[PDB]
Subunit: 221 residues, 5 copies
């Protein structure tokens, strides 16, 4: 299973303005595309309401597929929908699942049968310049201690997917949880790991409520 | 006790797209109607704030809080449909939620304690050093205690430091309330003398302004 | 005691009209009504060409932040204001100096405005205010005496903690522009340059009557 | 071959909204211009689909000529096509092959005229302030040691081209391979090189699929 | 003695809002007329440069200098009123002023010594390290001398490094002219070997282009 090929693309959009007072068929059209996409092996793990938690983000789409190419096609197809034409691209990064350095049983929840949860917290990651230059023992230790420190939070599901030379980052992280504050306390608790001493960048956070494209479109302004 | 409530707090900053119209008759009223309706659910609107002139790309800040984030999201998009909302671009909207303090569980944000909101506010995000939370518990304790001790001469300035890890780009959203603006000024200058200042990576943007009823605010905006 | 001071920077949306008959008078009218209310318009400055995203600055002060907020919105309603984009607007408030209390901003001591200005924000190092008082006393005394040879450059350094993103806002006015330049360069030799995190953006420009300023702008 | 004066320019664009549904002339009119520029010595090594992998890029052009002025003319002409009047410029940096400091048979894989592969990732590069002040031995060793580390990845072609004072950066980098995941593993593997301690900037990344102009015009939204 | 002259130099960079019309009418000529009128008032226009393609956000540069800042501001606003001006938006406009070099009073920017503009320019701002001006004089004097020596193989590249403290965000504006673009590239990479490289905080954006008469500039542009 450390041998699948799967590309994950999280892509974030913001309303150009408000959606129209009459938005009949906006939701349905997008759902239509989401199904014929699901025909091909392009799965839409979730769409997400990001309104109000960020001023420049309103909608997120999590899709994954077997080639980067299929995602690119999906992205452009969405932008042709009547909804995508009322949105502006904001941030859209792709990552690719690779075997973990040490613990080869570490697997992202979207490749481990796990259910999508109510809330998501997505964000890129970039380590210090000498993270990967460290004596393997030091990095395996900090990476293991850091996983211990989170064993109290199995109600928060992790996706931690390599992204080197797919964009500006080293990793794209996604956290799934039914209770939003459990994500908060996880981050807060993990500020205690020694790994925190080897971080260059973890911005921007996009955090939202997983929703059906029907009520998502109705919720948006 | 209050350290066991779940209260999400949201600060939403807007700027005029350009100017309100000359006749702005329905604008404040329609917004007050929405605020009244949000108050029927437990969506409380602690205040609206005039930020114009104190920052070139901010004119209006709504402070609201509620039991789920979803109600804030709902309230937010509902605001953006009002006539006032359609004259405004979003600029900065960040959510936080009270978590128990680490050492002193009697530290409670003012909005949680149902304190009275004051005439002026300064809201700003906050990010600690990378090694702040890794420092041995004794050293973080006496820097957190010493800094609150330095604030004793300013009881008129009411803190609202709230956790925000993974709600957005920051660790903490801070909101200070006082009836005289220069006292916020004087508190920060004085707190520059606390040793915790050596454990700061980020603390901008600042959104400072005057608390106003929605009718007066909509009248005085360009 | 208690004077708030505001520097408001705008840039053209495009150009002004060819026929700009009303524009300067309308603004001068409002400046006159504000001076009645004790909202002082200390100057308007032409910033064009010296920065691509800035064309005019207004320096106004008053007894409360609120009067300035009100003045700022009134100005954005004029014809000239409606032809502008807000770029950078930051307030400060004088507080008595930490060490030498004769040291006060020029515009409180009522000195005349000079021909040119350069306005910029300031943020000191994280540990500047944690230093022993005698160290900060020495560095402030020394940086100030290095400036003895530039008595033609008037300072206005004004605390701005919690009003916006900065700790101080700085305004230098001199009759010859190059004198500001040489002052800056010479002070790069003060030890206090070791305790700086941020000192941009600079807005530098020519003091002009509002009439002359409207006509010269693109 | 370290004597050839060759300027190479990568030009990134993004859609202003979307192309029209009726895009008949679009892909053809561009392909004409490419034919003319190749009649001069303006080689167009590839067009690339960048969409979805970045929210603010959709199309990259990799061109190169004997003179920088030729590329400037090519650029303004392309911006005159119907496809070009449909794009905002996003990022366009030029570089120029100079001999290597130590190993003069390291030469960009594009003036050793090779084959453009399916996938490219392009990004700028700026070294630490003191990298060039290091004793020649130390910089020699690190560049050599980092070259060894990429032996396992010979299906990935390196172009790394000096850029000093043609723009903000010190080099432009382009990596091309037929299997996208191989660029990913190469970057990750190379984070173990000592030269990682002498890096100040390496972004934005532009990664995408080489495509023929007609196929690319049809794919974009 | 050129050290006692006062000469303000301004580089003004613009990008196209979209693309120029097909019918470029007297676009080139209206601008050339204004340059001539400015030339009459001792507003020298050393060069106009094609930036396009080498930077996605710049197509045109104007290098003009004069005896007062004010004259350059007027030139600038007048240029913006031309038909070409109305088809551009400003990107980056910085002014500088020659002041006597710290140690070697013979170092003089090329334009002030009335040398000939070459085919290619690269312009960029510069900001030194915080302690740069605080190093003991002989450390800084040695480092600048050595950096001079390292440039001796490049006399075909002319330097115009000029003080800009307080005129904008920087310490110096630098402008290098050469007849062959690759000589600039090579000088830069060669000077990375100077010790002064350890005392650098900022040196972007770079605007690098080809010197062109207004007419063919306006014609080659998109």
């Amino acid at each position: 299973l450390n041998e699948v090929i799967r590309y994950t693309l999280w892509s974030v959009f913001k309303l150009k303005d408000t959606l129209p007072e009459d938005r009949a068929g906006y939701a349905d059209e997008v759902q239509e595309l989401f199904d014929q996409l699901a025909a091909k092996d392009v799965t839409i793990r979730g769409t997400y309401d990001l309104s109000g938690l960020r001023a420049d983000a309103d909608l997120m789409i999590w899709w994954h597929a077997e080639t980067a190419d299929q995602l690119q096609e999906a992205y452009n197809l969405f932008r042709r929908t009547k909804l995508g034409r009322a949105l502006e691209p904001v941030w859209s990064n792709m990552a690719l699942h690779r075997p973990a350095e040490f613990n080869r049983s570490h697997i992202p929840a979207f490749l481990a049968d796990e259910t999508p949860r109510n809330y998501i917290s997505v964000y890129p990651f970039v380590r210090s310049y000498d993270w990967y230059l460290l004596p393997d023992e030091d990095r395996r230790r900090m990476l293991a201690d850091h996983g211990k420190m989170a064993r109290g939070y199995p109600d928060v599901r992790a996706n931690t997917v390599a992204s080197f030379s797919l964009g500006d980052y080293e990793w794209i992280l996604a956290f799934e949880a039914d209770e939003l504050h459990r994500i908060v306390d996880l981050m807060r608790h993990l500020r205690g790991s020694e790994a925190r001493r080897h971080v260059r960048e973890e911005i921007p956070f996009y955090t939202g409520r997983r929703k059906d494209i029907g009520e998502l479109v109705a919720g948006l302004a």
